[PDB]
Design a protein around this ligand. Structure first.
Ligand SMILES: CC[C@]1(O)C[C@@H]2CN(CCc3c([nH]c4ccccc34)[C@@](C(=O)OC)(c3cc4c(cc3OC)N(C)[C@H]3[C@@](O)(C(=O)OC)[C@H](OC(C)=O)[C@]5(CC)C=CCN6CC[C@]43[C@@H]65)C2)C1
Ligand SMILES: Nc1nc2c(ncn2[C@@H]2O[C@H](COP(=O)(O)OP(=O)(O)OP(=O)(O)O)[C@@H](O)[C@H]2O)c(=O)[nH]1
Ligand SMILES: Nc1ncnc2c1ncn2[C@@H]1O[C@H](COP(=O)(O)OP(=O)(O)CP(=O)(O)O)[C@@H](O)[C@H]1O
Ligand SMILES: Nc1nc2c(ncn2[C@@H]2O[C@H](COP(=O)(O)OP(=O)(O)O)[C@@H](O)[C@H]2O)c(=O)[nH]1
Ligand SMILES: [Ca+2]
Ligand SMILES: [Ca+2]
Ligand SMILES: [Mg+2]
Ligand SMILES: [Mg+2]
Lengths: 346, 54, 439, 427
């Protein structure tokens, strides 16, 4: 009997991993403050990583990587990319971004230096904040941040996204990545496009149901029109890429996604790996990307505590148990992931 | 990068290497806190003995 | 030359001390009877080893050490063991009955009846000191005596010797070898009461040591003898600058200046490498790069914790053996690129380095292989607070139900000292968090 | 050189007490004469804990033998080790106590109690550093129960800063016939809750079940029961008698075992269980470990699964692997973790001594402070109420001067003790 505890009740995904384990009849759930666990499914804030790996006779594993927040907060992410040489300011696939503070460190100065070479090029000069707003004018955004309180990010907006017809629509791609205790980086073969349900409005930014593709903000404003829940899965979008553009998902988009995923996670490996440590981590991430009209993939953000889409829970949560958990803790007695590895010689 | 304060001798050497620059109670209060505790003991023992005498 | 007095308190302090003085003797070629051929100035000196040993007309080198335990069994073993002549009986002080794993009984109850004798015995040694710098104090956090009496001793030493420095060697409790369930209570209490009186304390988690001995010395089930020989190697490494010609960490004040910029945050992490079994038939000697790199592995630390997720305020490296600076700087350059090493904004990212060419001496027939070069890193990192959090959570769990509290009240201590000790630790956890993390 | 004074009172006390001295004398290589004939220095290193030295290099038990009737003390004298006891430490009356606590506590026992205390005091005076007292007695009779508790109270008056420890035999109608036993027991438990630091509950119910069901003894006697009691007493006193780290004195044991002053009643366990008959196989470490924790191995008739362990001490004896002991101990806690209160971290401690007990290569002794001991107290409580609610048999007690009020206070305290264990079983 292996033992586990649960410390985030609101986790769609770890709810399902709970049940999947109980139903094996080889795992007992313990009360959440009983320290004699093999597995911690942890809270989201202030997870007490310092208390793990100090129970003799227990190999302990936890479903978060400490220090992974550096990838998973927006402010942090921009800082990481600029400062890390493996990534760099030169980095092709992340939108130009800047970290900006309310006047209640900063790079406001350096924000304007790029703004006013787009008022010296008259070219696309549309940006975006971090409850969020898109403008062309600088002082309408800076005055928005100061009238808010937290640290924010100002980011180039992709004026020229790929648009799905029928609908002249906007979408984003969520891919799910599981990094195990060995630092094997596993991409779930099923991604999902979270779609807009209203024609993309080039010349009017306030009408936000067409610019923001979040699953709620479509629910609470045509929702359901072209596909279920503004959710298009990979078979359909591969088909559409074939019929409409004569390409494939794999070639036009996925190589880039796989490349961005590996790059991000190999960057932070030395800071978060649990290889020689007295407890072991794994963690599920949600990577979100944006695809421009040229078929160039852009990294939007990384989520440390993603929820999955409904159709896919069944399968993804089982995959976590298969590769994250029973690889550490075997039972007696097809792979839904693609392992991300690449040793080029140079 | 920069090595400084190199000090050699027959036993060994020592130095500093810099990769980057920056950016009480009295003998009285004690003897007292010890004696309030001994009082508290003595009282507690007294309460027991008194109880045993009942 | 400025003398240093060592004080070993409780079973843990005493047994560790034993092992240290054994090691020191071998290191300086001083025999069990206390004779040192290589010392030509008979009857005195102001050599570097004299900081720790004093001399007699008869050619005898005697530790500047006092051992105290509130029961006699353990110290009796010093009194009749291979080093009996080394010490003067006045340096070995024992009581009749111990503190029964009770801070409060060591501090308040039995402390009182023996503090004055200990101070008088300590003064006898200070009176033979031309320019005493202070004290090195060895004890457990978990024992009644080690916790309770040490903290009383430290309060009194601040009174009788205010200008002088006090360093600790403190054994942090681990269930694999612990003997009492109230160790967490004791450890918070003595940390609370000792904090202002201590300039710099080196914690050793028995857990960390026990696993080093399992994993690297292939000792299925390590004893105190196994643990204490390893601890004495680290201790020797740290105090070598006080007993040997050099220019790094030559007086106790310098420990504080090099390792402790913020006084409450005075707990530097020791990491040591390499630890190699003497039974290992075939051994490939490790380089400067290899052992230096190993100082950033948590598995070699004296306290398991993760310096990646915290910041540094100071970092020394103390090498012993065949090491020259060129090799050190090359090792450091490489490492700086391979690892997460983050200092606080108000501090130079930088290392201070001590090399002593004589390689580690090893105890004959012991577990440790003699090696060409070794290193001990002392880094003051905020990561060591992980050990405070561990201990504090255990304390909160029992204290919440007042479990065992009555044993302490019974000895005259007040319930409120518990919550007061713990508020101090909660503040300590906060200081470490201010310094060490950003967002 | 941290001394214990041993007192044994009444029939049961003296019988199990004599058997204790037989067993440990042998373990320490002392013979009936009192002469050491052992072959090891580990036997003599803390010998002075239980034995005084005498002219001649003779070892004399620091033992006081007490009864209100001469019968059993003649039994002890003509017994095998009878000659070893200090003759002036036999204190005895003539009239007996007739299984009446009140006679033991107030009338017949008061008359004898001062002489017992003179002998105690003399033994305490010749003590380099006294740690405290251990007493053996039953709770269901009159002398062990009533006078033993009177003693405990008087000893605490004179040595209030010493530890008091009992081995207290709890009665069962599976063994014994006399209808007032629950009365004597409830009144004694009342005393024990107030005036001891550690009490080993030795339940005759459990000793019967073990002998009869498990050891297939269809005609069990006190010898058989006592064979289990002595094994367990040897085992719980191992850490006091031999060199060691854990629980090496009474006060350390108490600090480790008693988180709340009233909850100081321990469930002992032992493995392997045997009758006085050859054991052909040494047990393995996993077997000891599983068995010592088995409900069927407990010397108090409680289900450990019905409660939670507050604290535990475990003692392994014999030449065995410390690694494997450590692993199995951990495996128990980790595999049944819900049984161990989570608000006392690392509440299980483990000792290993190499000198095994006589006739066994491997043994293990268990000492549990578990909330399940309430079941023992509820069982005595139910017996008590059934009679007391009709004041039945009370005249035996009122006729020696007692009031009913005193019975109401004992029942109440014992009921309070049960609900305190219940309180911590749900916390
Ligand atoms: C260990 C001490 C002991 O020997 C234990 C039992 C009782 N005594 C004396 C020995 C004895 C026993 N039986 C005796 C009959 C006459 C004279 C003496 C005895 C003894 C035994 O060896 O049985 C073979 C015994 C006795 C009993 C006994 C068992 C027993 O030995 C197996 N019983 C558990 C009870 C008893 O009350 C009960 O509940 O049994 C189901 C039992 O009733 C029965 C058998 O119907 C009985 C039998 C006499 C009824 C009267 C109340 N007492 C209480 C003890 C009980 C008994 C053994 C002391
Ligand atoms: N490393 C090491 N730890 C020890 C040693 N002895 C005891 N300990 C640890 O220290 C704690 C016990 O405290 P002790 O030093 O034995 O206690 P004491 O100071 O003698 O106090 P009392 O016996 O209560 O009077 C436990 O955590 C033990 O594991 C030792 O020789 N080496
Ligand atoms: N630079 C940019 N160019 C184009 N669209 C952008 C953009 N930045 C944000 N968006 C749009 O806003 C949407 C949601 O933004 P974002 O992902 O930054 O916030 P969020 O954390 O609340 C949702 P999630 O946690 O699922 O990623 C994106 O899916 C995208 O459509
Ligand atoms: N285990 C055990 N129980 C006993 C022994 N002798 C008596 N008893 C029990 O003790 C109770 C009777 O008490 P007893 O000691 O004879 O009375 P006392 O002499 O006045 O103290 C009953 O519960 C008996 O079963 C014995 O040798 N061993
Ligand atoms: Ca000299
Ligand atoms: Ca009379
Ligand atoms: Mg001690
Ligand atoms: Mg009788």
């Amino acid at each position: 009997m292996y033992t586990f505890v649960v410390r985030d009740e609101n986790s769609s995904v770890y709810a399902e991993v709970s049940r999947l384990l109980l139903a094996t009849g080889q795992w007992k759930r313990l009360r959440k403050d009983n320290p004699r666990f093999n597995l911690m499914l942890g809270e989201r804030n202030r997870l007490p990583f310092g208390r793990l790996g100090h129970e003799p006779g227990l190999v302990q594993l936890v479903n978060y990587y400490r220090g992974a927040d550096k990838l998973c907060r927006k402010a942090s992410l921009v800082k990481l990319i600029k400062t890390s040489p493996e990534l760099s300011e030169s980095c092709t696939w992340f939108p130009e971004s800047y970290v900006i503070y309310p006047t209640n460190t900063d790079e406001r100065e350096v924000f304007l230096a790029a703004y006013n070479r787009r008022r010296e090029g008259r070219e696309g000069n549309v940006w975006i904040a971090k409850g969020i707003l898109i403008s062309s004018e600088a002082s309408e955004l800076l005055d928005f941040i100061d009238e808010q309180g937290q640290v924010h990010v100002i980011q180039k907006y992709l004026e020229k996204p790929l648009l799905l017809e029928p609908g002249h629509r906007k979408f984003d791609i969520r891919s799910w990545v599981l990094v195990d205790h060995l630092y094997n980086i596993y991409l779930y073969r099923e991604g999902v496009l979270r779609t807009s349900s209203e024609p993309y409005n080039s010349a009017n930014f306030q009408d936000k149901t067409c610019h923001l593709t979040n699953h709620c903000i479509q629910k609470e404003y045509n929702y359901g029109r072209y596909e279920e829940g503004n959710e298009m899965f990979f078979e359909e979008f591969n088909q559409y890429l074939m019929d409409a553009l004569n390409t494939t998902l794999e070639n036009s988009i996925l190589l880039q996604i796989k490349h961005i995923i590996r790059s991000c996670l190999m960057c932070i490996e030395p800071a978060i790996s649990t290889k020689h440590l007295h407890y072991q981590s794994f963690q599920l991430f949600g990577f979100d990307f944006m695809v421009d009209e040229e078929l160039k993939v852009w990294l939007i953000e990384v989520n440390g505590a993603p929820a999955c889409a409904q159709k896919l829970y069944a399968e993804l949560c089982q995959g976590i148990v298969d590769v994250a958990i029973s690889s550490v803790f075997p039972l007696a007695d097809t792979s839904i992931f693609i392992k991300l590895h690449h040793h080029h010689h140079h | 990068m920069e090595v400084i304060e190199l000090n050699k001798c027959t036993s060994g050497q020592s130095f500093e290497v810099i990769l980057k620059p920056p950016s009480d109670p009295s003998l009285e209060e004690i003897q007292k806190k010890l004696e309030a505790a001994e009082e508290r003991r003595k009282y507690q023992e007294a309460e027991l003995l008194k109880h045993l005498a009942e | 030359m400025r003398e240093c007095i060592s004080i070993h308190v409780g079973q843990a302090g005493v047994q560790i001390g034993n092992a240290c003085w054994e090691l020191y003797c071998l290191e300086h070629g001083i025999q069990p009877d206390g004779q040192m051929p290589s010392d030509k100035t008979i009857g005195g000196g102001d050599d570097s080893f004299n900081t720790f040993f004093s001399e007699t007309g008869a050619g005898k080198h005697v530790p500047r050490a006092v051992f105290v335990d509130l029961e006699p069994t353990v110290i009796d073993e010093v009194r009749t063991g291979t080093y009996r002549q080394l010490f003067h009986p006045e340096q070995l002080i024992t009581g009749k009955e111990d503190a029964a794993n009770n801070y409060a009984r060591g501090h308040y109850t039995i402390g009182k009846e023996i503090i004055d004798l200990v101070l008088d015995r300590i003064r006898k040694l200070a009176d033979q000191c031309t320019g005493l710098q202070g004290f090195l104090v060895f004890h457990s956090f978990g024992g009644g005596t080690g916790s309770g009496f040490t903290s009383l001793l430290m309060e009194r030493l601040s009174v009788d010797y205010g200008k002088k420095s006090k360093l600790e060697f403190s054994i942090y409790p681990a269930p694999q070898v612990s003997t009492a369930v109230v160790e967490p209570y004791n450890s918070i209490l003595t940390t609370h009461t000792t904090l202002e009186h201590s300039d710099c304390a080196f914690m050793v988690d028995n857990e960390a040591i026990y696993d080093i001995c399992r994993r690297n010395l292939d000792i299925e089930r390590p004893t105190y003898t196994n643990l204490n020989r390893l601890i004495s190697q680290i201790v020797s490494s740290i105090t070598a600058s006080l007993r040997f010609d050099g220019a790094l960490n030559v007086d106790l004040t310098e420990f504080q200046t090099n390792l402790v910029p913020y006084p409450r945050i005075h707990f530097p992490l020791a990491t040591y490498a390499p630890v190699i079994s003497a039974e290992k038939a075939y051994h490939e000697q490790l380089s400067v790069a290899e052992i230096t790199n190993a100082c950033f592995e948590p598995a070699n630390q004296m306290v398991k914790c993760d310096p990646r997720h915290g910041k540094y305020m100071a970092c020394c490296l103390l090498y012993r053996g065949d090491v020259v600076p060129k090799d050190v700087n090359a090792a450091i350059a490489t490492i700086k690129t391979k690892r997460s090493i983050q200092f606080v904004d108000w501090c130079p990212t930088g290392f201070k380095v001590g090399i002593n060419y004589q390689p580690p001496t090893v105890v004959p027939g012991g577990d440790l292989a003699k090696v060409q070069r070794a290193v001990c890193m002392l880094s003051n990192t905020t990561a060591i607070a992980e050990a405070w959090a561990r201990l504090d959570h255990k304390f909160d769990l029992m204290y919440a139900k007042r479990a065992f509290v009555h044993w302490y009240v019974g000895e005259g201590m007040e319930e409120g000292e518990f919550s007061e000790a713990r508020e101090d630790m909660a503040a300590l956890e906060k200081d470490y968090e201010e310094v060490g993390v950003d967002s | 050189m941290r001394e214990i004074v041993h007192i044994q009172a009444g029939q049961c006390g003296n019988q199990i007490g004599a058997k204790f001295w037989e067993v440990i004398s042998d373990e320490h290589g002392i013979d009936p004469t009192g002469s050491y004939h052992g072959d090891s220095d580990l036997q003599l290193e803390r010998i002075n804990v239980y034995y005084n030295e005498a002219a001649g290099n003779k070892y004399v038990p620091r033992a006081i033998l007490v009864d209100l009737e001469p019968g059993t003390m003649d039994s002890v004298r003509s017994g095998p080790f009878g000659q070893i006891f200090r003759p002036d430490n036999f204190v005895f009356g003539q009239s007996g106590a007739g299984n009446n606590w009140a006679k033991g506590h107030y009338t017949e026992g008061a008359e004898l109690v001062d002489s017992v205390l003179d002998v105690v005091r003399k033994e305490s005076e010749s003590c380099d550093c006294l740690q405290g007292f251990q007493l053996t007695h039953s709770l269901g009779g009159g002398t062990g129960s009533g006078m033993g508790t009177l003693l405990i109270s008087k000893i605490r008056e004179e040595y209030p800063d010493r530890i008091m420890n009992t081995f207290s035999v709890v009665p069962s109608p599976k063994v014994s016939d006399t209808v007032v036993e629950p009365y004597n027991a409830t009144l004694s438990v009342h005393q024990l809750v107030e005036n001891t630091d550690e009490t080993y509950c030795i339940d005759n119910e459990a000793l019967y079940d073990i002998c009869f069901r498990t050891l297939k003894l269809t005609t069990p006697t006190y010898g058989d029961l006592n064979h289990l009691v002595s094994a367990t007493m040897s085992g719980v006193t191992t850490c006091l008698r031999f060199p060691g780290q854990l629980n090496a004195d009474l006060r350390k044991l108490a600090v480790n075992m008693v988180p709340f002053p009233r909850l100081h009643f321990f469930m002992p366990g032992f493995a392997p269980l045997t009758s006085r008959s050859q054991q052909y196989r040494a047990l393995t470490v996993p077997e000891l470990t599983q068995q010592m924790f088995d409900a069927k191995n407990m010397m108090a008739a409680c289900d450990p699964r019905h409660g939670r362990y507050l604290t535990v001490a475990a003692v392994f004896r014999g030449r065995m692997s410390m690694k494997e002991v450590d692993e199995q101990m951990l495996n128990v806690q980790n595999k049944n973790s819900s049984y161990f209160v989570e608000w006392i971290p690392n509440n299980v401690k483990t000792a290993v001594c190499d000198i095994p007990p006589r006739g066994l290569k491997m043994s293990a002794t268990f000492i549990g402070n578990s909330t399940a001991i309430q079941e023992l107290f509820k069982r005595i409580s139910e017996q008590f109420t059934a009679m007391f609610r009709r004041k039945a048999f009370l005249h035996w007690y009122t006729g020696e001067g007692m009031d009913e009020m005193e019975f109401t206070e004992a029942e109440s305290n014992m009921n309070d003790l049960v609900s305190e264990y219940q309180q911590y079983q749900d916390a």
